[PDB]
Amino acid sequence: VRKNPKSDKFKVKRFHHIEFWCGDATNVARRFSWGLGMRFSAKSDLSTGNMVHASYLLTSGDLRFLFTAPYSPSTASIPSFDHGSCRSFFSSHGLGVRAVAIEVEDAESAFSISVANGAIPSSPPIVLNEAVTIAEVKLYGDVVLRYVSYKFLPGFERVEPLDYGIRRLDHAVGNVPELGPALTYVAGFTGFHQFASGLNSAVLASNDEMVLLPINEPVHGTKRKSQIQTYLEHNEGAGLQHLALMSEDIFRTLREMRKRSSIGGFDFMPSPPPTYYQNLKKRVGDVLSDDQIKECEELGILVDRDDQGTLLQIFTKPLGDRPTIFIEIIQRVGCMMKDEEGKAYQSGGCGGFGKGNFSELF
Ligand SMILES: [Fe+2]
Numbered sequence: 001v002r003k004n005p006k007s008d009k010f011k012v013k014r015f016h017h018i019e020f021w022c023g024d025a026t027n028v029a030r031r032f033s034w035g036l037g038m039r040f041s042a043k044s045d046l047s048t049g050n051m052v053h054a055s056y057l058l059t060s061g062d063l064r065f066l067f068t069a070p071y072s073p074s075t076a077s078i079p080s081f082d083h084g085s086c087r088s089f090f091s092s093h094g095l096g097v098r099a100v101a102i103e104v105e106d107a108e109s110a111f112s113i114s115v116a117n118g119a120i121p122s123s124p125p126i127v128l129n130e131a132v133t134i135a136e137v138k139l140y141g142d143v144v145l146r147y148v149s150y151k152f153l154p155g156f157e158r159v160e161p162l163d164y165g166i167r168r169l170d171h172a173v174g175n176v177p178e179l180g181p182a183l184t185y186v187a188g189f190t191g192f193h194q195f196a197s198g199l200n201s202a203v204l205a206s207n208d209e210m211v212l213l214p215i216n217e218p219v220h221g222t223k224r225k226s227q228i229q230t231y232l233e234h235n236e237g238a239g240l241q242h243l244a245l246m247s248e249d250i251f252r253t254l255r256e257m258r259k260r261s262s263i264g265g266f267d268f269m270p271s272p273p274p275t276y277y278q279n280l281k282k283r284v285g286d287v288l289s290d291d292q293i294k295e296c297e298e299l300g301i302l303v304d305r306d307d308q309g310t311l312l313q314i315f316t317k318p319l320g321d322r323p324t325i326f327i328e329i330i331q332r333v334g335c336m337m338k339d340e341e342g343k344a345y346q347s348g349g350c351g352g353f354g355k356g357n358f359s360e361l362f
Pocket residue numbers: 173242244328353
């Protein structure tokens with residue numbers, strides 16, 4: 001049990017979409033659709049009227065991935081987009097997340113309050129066809145915290161079939177040179193609270209903790225070379241590290257994804273040895289049955305547990321050429337609570353963040 005001061009400065013409903021700034025929105029969006037089991041939902045390319053950028057939205061349950069690339073400089077759906085910036089971002093950082101957007105009740109207001117509390121402004125509020133309002137502030141590095149509030153986006157034409165299980169964004173993570181400033185800077189204008197080996201982190205969270213922003217900090221010292229000090233060097237600075245994808249069946253998902261590694265999909269971190277799993281049976285027993293412990297071992301899932309739930313997670317190697325951004329698929333078993341005010345659901349951060357992993361290799 002921990003402390004939650006529910007001190008947001010604005011209403012933060014839930015994670016919306018993640019926007020990648022590529023060099024070619026087309027291939028990445030294709031590669032991904034195959035790899036994570038996501039559907040081609042919408043677009044805003046030349047075929048729609050856009051002559052500034054190509055943008056493809058792939059979805060899976062509430063999870064939405066947006067891929068945008070710039071056209072030749074010689075009418076654009078996303079108003080905050082501008083050539084040179086998209087160019088440079090990609091030229092200097094490579095494939096990666098440019099935007100971490102979250103739903104809010106009033107984007108202009110959210111952006112209003114945020115700016116009055118130290119938030120650095122990149123993009124001003126913009127109402128698009130009296131329907132959606134979009135505003136963007138600086139999170140860390142060249143990643144922006146995009147505010148999206150409603151009455152996908154205007155200008156995108158709907159498209160009309162994969163599904164490996166992915167359902168929503170659990171948490172987004174960003175590595176920075178110094179955890180200190182970053183934390184106070186983010187928590188400062190948002191009003192998030194602290195949810196909770198060559199790295200240091202803390203996790204800010206929205207009121208309902210259905211928005212988790214874990215931030216990492218490198219650790220100079222005699223114990224290998226900080227992986228995070230490695231991300232900062234190849235990514236050329238602070239940038240979004242990994243995205244946790246919430247699946248309702250991590251077994252359904254890893255079967256599907258792993259069957260696709262050698263044919264376009266994603267590769268996975270080397271899995272724990274058989275002694276790791278043998279321990280598992282007598283450590284998470286009551287949560288996962290034998291046939292399930294055996295499935296973890298076969299897909300290479302890492303398990304960790306705490307006072308409210310159990311967590312099954314795994315990790316992907318870099319999504320791109322640089323050992324920078326990678327993906328994670330997870331499942332949080334436990335914490336399910338059915339109240340009389342609403343429907344049955346599950347608290348946020350259930351099981352935590354597998355913190356009890358690297359240790360479990362006793
Ligand atoms: Fe994570």
